[PDB]
A and B are shown apart, each in its own frame.
Chain A
Amino acid sequence: KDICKYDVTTKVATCEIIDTIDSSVLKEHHTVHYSITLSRWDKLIIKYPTNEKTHFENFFVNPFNLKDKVLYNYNKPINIEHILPGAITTDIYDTRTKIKQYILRIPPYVHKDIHFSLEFNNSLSLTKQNQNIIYGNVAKIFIHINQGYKEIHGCDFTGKYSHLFTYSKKPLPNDDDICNVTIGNNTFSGFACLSHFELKPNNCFSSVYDYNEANKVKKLFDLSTKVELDHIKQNTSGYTLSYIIFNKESTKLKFSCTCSSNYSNYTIRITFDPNYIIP
């Protein structure tokens, strides 16, 4: 564990691949490998450089589209949503440091073991020192994900994420189905709708309808803070998804969310009771 560290408290896997591919130092190995094993809900954050950062002028990434694709079986590029359905990837870039961040959130449930890599090629970059023209190298990250233990106690209306959520139904032309779930403390829940549907309130779980306060548009932070959540607006498959879990929250909570279209509408209803226990 030289560049990739996994903190258990935050369940965060931070990998730094900058000085390892720096083209200013003589290097004995052209391919530097680092392996990481991840489980449900783990978060992988890789901090890589850009073309603007010095010594990484001709830097590039493989697959060139990180947010969408990965190197499946360390071989052929494949959309990450295909092998890890319900995952969430984000790309950040700090112009002050010329450094980007690839952030991967593993879904709360992984139905099948998955192995895939990500390459960071800096071989094309170079520097000139003394009578030498030093070059960069490439670094490969091999990520393995275990089986995900338990199906999320959430709702799925796309019908595609049946293995991920407890409730799944194939979308119908005209339907007003409403999914009700009872969740406890430190239990996962979520929803899955089609991307072109309207989310109500927008970016749900972060701003849920305050059913106690008569279905009020308010940030969930006001209702509670001992919660963890995530959400993707549209994946490669064209579906919006969100997840939530309460952590040492003593207050009983009831909130809701809605995906609506001109043809049908679907509603998620969740009841957080810390004393509630699954049958």
Chain B
Amino acid sequence: QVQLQESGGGLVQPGGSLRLSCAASGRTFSSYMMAWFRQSQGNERELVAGLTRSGVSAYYADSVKGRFTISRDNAKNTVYLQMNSLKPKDTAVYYCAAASTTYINHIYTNPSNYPHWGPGTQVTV
């Protein structure tokens, strides 16, 4: 029902900033849990940022902790991932995953638990 779309990712010099936006269609974001996923070349998908349906409980992986920040413009139906102080490890195809749950205070860890996914955007630094 919900379709995701990433946008706003490219090449940057180490120490810069980017704002990756993810738009959904079909249903409102409030009814879904959201997460940003990493995937470097020839590596598994890791989780960087997560967001429960409450919109107030945000999780940040220890790698991007202290530098990334997730947000939800419910009017525009978009999730923004602000990524500051970009480091060489951040080079990956950032994906936007969304799951459907009837609980507002939890977020899944493994990418398999996420039914809906979006076409990732590459972020090289």
Contacts and interface: CB of A to CB of B under 8 A. Distances in A.
Interface of A: 23, 26-30, 123-124, 126, 128, 131-137
A26 B52 CA distance: 11
Contacts of B50: 133
Contacts of B104: 27-30, 137
Contact of A124 (B57, B103, B109, B113): B57
A29 B53 CA distance: 10
24 contacts: A26-B103, A26-B105, A27-B104, A28-B102, A28-B103, A28-B104, A30-B54, A30-B104, A123-B54, A126-B59, A128-B109, A131-B113, A132-B106, A132-B108, A132-B109, A133-B106, A133-B107, A133-B108, A133-B109, A135-B54, A135-B105, A136-B57, A136-B105, A137-B54
A123 B56 contact: yes
B110 interface: yes
B105 A131 contact: no
A130 to B, nearest CB: 9
Contact of B107 (A27, A30, A132): A132
Nearest to A30: B54
A110 to B, nearest CB: 35
B108 A23 contact: no
A27 B110 contact: no
Contacts of B107: 132-133, 135
A27 B57 contact: no
Contact of A30 (B59, B105, B109, B113): B105
A26 B106 CA distance: 7
Contacts of A131: 108-110, 113
B57 A123 contact: yes
Main secondary structure, interface of B, reads loop
B105 A137 contact: yes
Nearest to A133: B107
Return the 6 tightest CB-CB contacts between A and B, nearest first. Answer: A135-B57, A30-B54, A135-B105, A26-B103, A134-B106, A27-B105
Contacts of A135: 52, 54, 57, 105-107
Contacts of B103: 26-28
A26 to B, nearest CB: 4
Interface in B86-125: 102-110, 113
Interface string B44-58: 000000101010110
A135 B50 CA distance: 12
Contacts of B105: 23, 26-27, 30, 123, 134-137
A131 B106 CA distance: 10
Nearest to B107: A133
Nearest to B101: A26
Nearest to B52: A135
A54 B110 CA distance: 25
Interface in B14-61: 50, 52, 54, 56-57, 59
A126 B54 CA distance: 13
A118 to B, nearest CB: 18
B69 to A, nearest CB: 14
B59 A133 contact: yes
Contacts of A136: 57, 105
B106 A30 contact: no
Nearest to A128: B109
A235 B44 CA distance: 60
